[PDB]
Design a protein around this ligand. Structure first.
Ligand SMILES: [Mg+2]
Ligand SMILES: [Mg+2]
Ligand SMILES: [Zn+2]
Ligand SMILES: [Zn+2]
Ligand SMILES: [Zn+2]
Ligand SMILES: [Zn+2]
Lengths: 449, 449
């Protein structure tokens, strides 16, 4: 009988110093693999995104948190793996732009068309194109948009919004930065306002600050975005205790949890990498962030509730879970913050895999939007940028380096990265593919049309 | 009827600026993938190694040489893809050392045991472990070691030598650096001397300078290694014309092609990346190296002759082909040298695939020993290191950055990287695995004892 399996253990089998003791497999894969291939329809889809989580970011967090011959119960457990390209286009010339930002890349997987960096839901001609979420809804599936960033940030926003610039978070930014989108200029509106329009059953993340602006035009003009929200029938939740009370999230009782002003809190603290830090300074060991909270639902927590609330919908559902801050810490050149965010995501992947595993008609996908700056280097390295030596779980040190930007932020990079899936149609991620392929893969598995 | 396919075309299907025009797939993969799964015995094995070829290196060369939405006929054509870790061990503590060198990495895939950086065919206790090459010979299969580096370099040497240090190239380096291996101290010998002893049917590379040293002890002492070679029955070939004349390679007429003093010549010329090169200097366009030659066999040429010569062996064969200078140009901070060497290996993968495709019982594998330094960044980047702007195939510029070493050489890095295969047992690379797994995978597909 055909049951699709999760790689349960890819950890180094024994004594890493002894022959074959560092092997990760116990026997031939053929059958296991031939047992995880199915073309049946996907009833639901859970797309987990580690912002900036390339293979470097994955390897680095593993070494610290699980040891080199370790294994990530979530991230590393998806059996079907590939590599996908994420280049953008230069708005002016339609020619590839090798390093994408999180806006253009999101647009690609959510709409199938490529775009200029900074765009959301529009192509180089600034023409809207419907997002997979919008399509799930029209079809009648339940829909979830969950993140650890502000909900107006590129990754989550790209599901609900179509503006010419990611910066048009709300009423004012928009008027000035996206006039042709500005309500009063008769546009569809700012990102937050377009978010309120799209009505996803479950929307959870930070970014409450912006909801405190008021409309310049339209029916709810003169009153805040926070107001219109409840006035439009939204059920709002600010802490975890209340998040749990929620027993229904639907088109009449749609949930909107704003758990932080800007970005929800990072899991681990640690200092910034610094010029010659692996030599001048002593090895660091990450420290859990005391202010991350009992009142703040973890990502894992948000994902579980969402899958629970979205599972009651008979027809099936679409959920996009985003571990936001990996990218934000990485450009920040903070190993500890970076790593903490990846483990943090490992939990969300796990919750997701636990459900699909039983449900049986769930395609779970884990990937990133683009690659980033961090590199794992030798302990004795003399580098041009910011480095830092960390004490890993092996009790050996690891040196992380960020050296592609003299400015404040460490730069995104452009290499192809890991794309992994599990479930009906996961075959479609194996081998080399393009980020726009993800959109088409998700539309067919769902039979969306 | 069960025929295993090669991804024919994962090129951007259409107008990269139009909806779904940038997709790489044309339909559902499930069946193609089901069709490429087989646990039959591998009759032969071809192991293509891109030194330092991580995903960044792969993505970069494609962008330049094929276009962003391009597709590499060899490298990207392998249907089953995975990611594998290559950490080394600290000799002293047996703990993991996250950034491996080319010697310790090679040791792993060729013997199954982890080892300290700089080691070749011995573990941290310095005890020898038999290489996959030695076992293929012992079992009766034909065997080849083809590279574009010096045959005493780590990658090719790891197949036939067991020395406590990669530096013990020949008679004298060894005496002073691997005394316990030195012939006169009663050891097995230098790397070159051990190579002449292993006697693979076909060995082709550069590194002819070392063959001009003499033995200090032993039967052929006092005479050069070049001499010992022909006296030991090796048929030597120095150029491409004579390489071709060769209609036989076997244990009595074993082939030794030494095509260059040091490392054979690089495919393309271009200047070094430099501090603020993408701003200060103009975009670069690679130029083919006129000193490459009509007399110097390409890597694709060596591979073809080897498969040819090794196919005569009824029983099957083991061939390891190395695209050597990728890693060498990379640390050199030379985008063009780097990118050419990848292109160069793409042709060798294609020959391999062409054969494997028709023979029908060949497992083709393509991977790297470790990730490297180069990163693809934004054109406007201000970086601490060495950078350069290249005019790609798309007629748009791409910026390459190397910023993990102030020293002369850019450092290897440690994230997991692509591993891809084709053929019987190719399943065993899909997912996350360790480099030592490749050995056990190759062992079993060959049935090796
Ligand atoms: Mg994001
Ligand atoms: Mg090499
Ligand atoms: Zn991003
Ligand atoms: Zn970013
Ligand atoms: Zn190497
Ligand atoms: Zn190297």
């Amino acid at each position: 009988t055909p049951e699709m399996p999760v790689l349960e253990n890819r950890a180094a089998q024994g004594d890493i110093t002894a022959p074959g003791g560092a092997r990760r497999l116990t026997g031939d894969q053929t059958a296991a693999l031939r047992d995880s291939l199915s073309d049946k329809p996907a009833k639901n889809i859970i797309l987990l995104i580690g912002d900036g989580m390339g293979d470097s970011e994955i390897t680095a967090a593993r070494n610290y948190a699980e040891g080199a011959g370790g294994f990530f119960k979530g991230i590393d457990a998806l059996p079907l793996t590939g590599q996908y390209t994420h280049y953008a286009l230069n708005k002016k010339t339609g020619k590839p732009d090798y390093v994408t930002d999180s806006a253009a890349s999101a647009t690609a997987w959510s709409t199938g068309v490529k775009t200029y960096n900074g765009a959301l839901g529009v192509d180089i001609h600034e023409k809207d194109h419907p997002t997979i979420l919008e399509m799930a809804k029209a079809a009648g599936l339940a829909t979830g948009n969950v993140s650890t960033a502000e909900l107006q940030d590129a990754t989550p926003a790209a599901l609900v919004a179509h503006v010419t610039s990611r910066k048009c978070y709300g009423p004012s930014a928009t008027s000035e930065k996206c006039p042709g989108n500005a309500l009063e200029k008769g546009g569809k509106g700012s990102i937050t306002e377009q978010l309120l329009n799209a009505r996803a059953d479950v929307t959870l993340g930070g970014g409450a600050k912006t909801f405190a602006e008021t409309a310049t035009a339209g029916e709810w003009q003169g009153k805040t975005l926070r107001e219109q929200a409840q006035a439009r029938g939204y059920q709002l939740v600010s802490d975890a205790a209340s998040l749990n009370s929620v027993t229904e999230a639907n088109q009449q009782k749609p949930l909107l949890g704003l758990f932080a002003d800007g970005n929800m809190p990072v899991r681990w603290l640690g200092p910034k990498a610094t010029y010659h830090g692996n030599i001048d300074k002593p090895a660091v060991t990450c420290t859990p962030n005391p202010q991350r909270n009992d009142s703040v639902p973890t990502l894992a927590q948000m994902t579980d509730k969402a899958i629970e609330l979205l599972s009651k919908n008979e027809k099936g559902f679409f959920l996009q879970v985003e571990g936001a801050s990996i990218d934000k810490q990485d450009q920040a050149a903070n190993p500890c913050g970076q790593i903490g965010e990846t483990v943090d995501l490992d939990e969300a992947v796990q919750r997701a895999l636990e459900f699909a595993k039983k449900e049986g008609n769930t395609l779970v996908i884990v990937t990133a939007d683009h690659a980033h700056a961090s590199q794992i280097v030798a302990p004795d390295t003399k580098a041009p940028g910011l480095t830092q030596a960390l004490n890993t779980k092996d009790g050996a040190v690891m040196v992380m380096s960020y050296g592609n930007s003299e400015e404040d932020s460490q730069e995104h990079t452009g290499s192809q990265l890991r794309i992994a899936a599990y479930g009906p149609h996961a075959a479609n991620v194996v081998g080399l593919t393009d980020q726009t392929d993800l959109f088409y893969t998700m539309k067919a598995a769902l039979g969306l049309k």
